[PDB]
Amino acid sequence: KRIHIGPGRAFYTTXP
Amino acid sequence: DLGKKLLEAARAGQDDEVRILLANGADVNTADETGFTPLHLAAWEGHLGIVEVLLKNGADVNANDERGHTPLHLAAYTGHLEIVEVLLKNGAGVNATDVIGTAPLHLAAMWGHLEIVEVLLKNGADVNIQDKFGKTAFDISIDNGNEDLAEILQKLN
């Protein structure tokens, strides 16, 4: 998974 | 209106303008479409002084954006150690989880934010928390190849 974080375009991933 | 300005001022690190807007009645807990409050944005951008002002002015330390991220999640991910500490000083949920079970310790561990992981653990961070895919913070540090961090998060039993 791609999980967006913060007010920008950043994202963290865990698994898919 | 006033909430919008307060969001941008917190984002831009304009400590004086944040104080002005609060004095003129700006909702310290105003939220944009994504759910970010001024305290979210100050923690994300690293503006410790504004975080302090917002918290003294009644900011919700545990406000969730639409992804379940609190200001402590954002400070943990962005590596803002001073802000992490201040939030924890103000009762931030150290084990708060976003919509897929990710806690600040995971986010700190991701980027090898060594000192932040230590502060989170000092304030009751649970190393055994797993996100929806079974990943602990220790697991993340192994996956990312961060040796020094694994030793600090290591469980023995």
Author numbering:
A (entry chain C): 5 to 20
B (entry chain A): 13 to 169
Quote the study that presented this structure, word for word.
Using the Designed Ankyrin Repeat Proteins (DARPin) technology, we previously developed the V3-crown specific DARPin 5m3_D12 that shares features with cross-neutralizing V3-crown Abs and has activity against difficult to neutralize (Tier-2) strains of HIV-1 subtype B27. Notably, 5m3_D12 partially by-passes V1V2 shielding, suggesting that generation of DARPin based broadly neutralizing V3-crown inhibitors may be possible. Due to their rigid interaction surface, DARPins often bind to a specific conformation of their target, as exemplified by the cross-neutralizing V3 DARPin 5m3_D1226,27,31. Exemplary for this, 5m3_D12 displays a strong binding preference for a specific V3-crown conformation. 5m3_D12 and 63_B7 were co-crystallized with V3-IY (MN). We only noted a potential effect of glycosylation on 5m3_D12: Introduction of a glycan at N197 strongly decreased sensitivity, conversely the T388A substitution (and to a lower extent also N386A) led to a decrease in sensitivity, suggesting that loss of this glycan may lead to altered structural dynamics of the V3 loop that do not favor 5m3_D12 binding. In support of this, the V3-IY conformation preferred by 5m3_D12 was only rarely sampled in a V3 MD simulation on deglycosylated gp120.
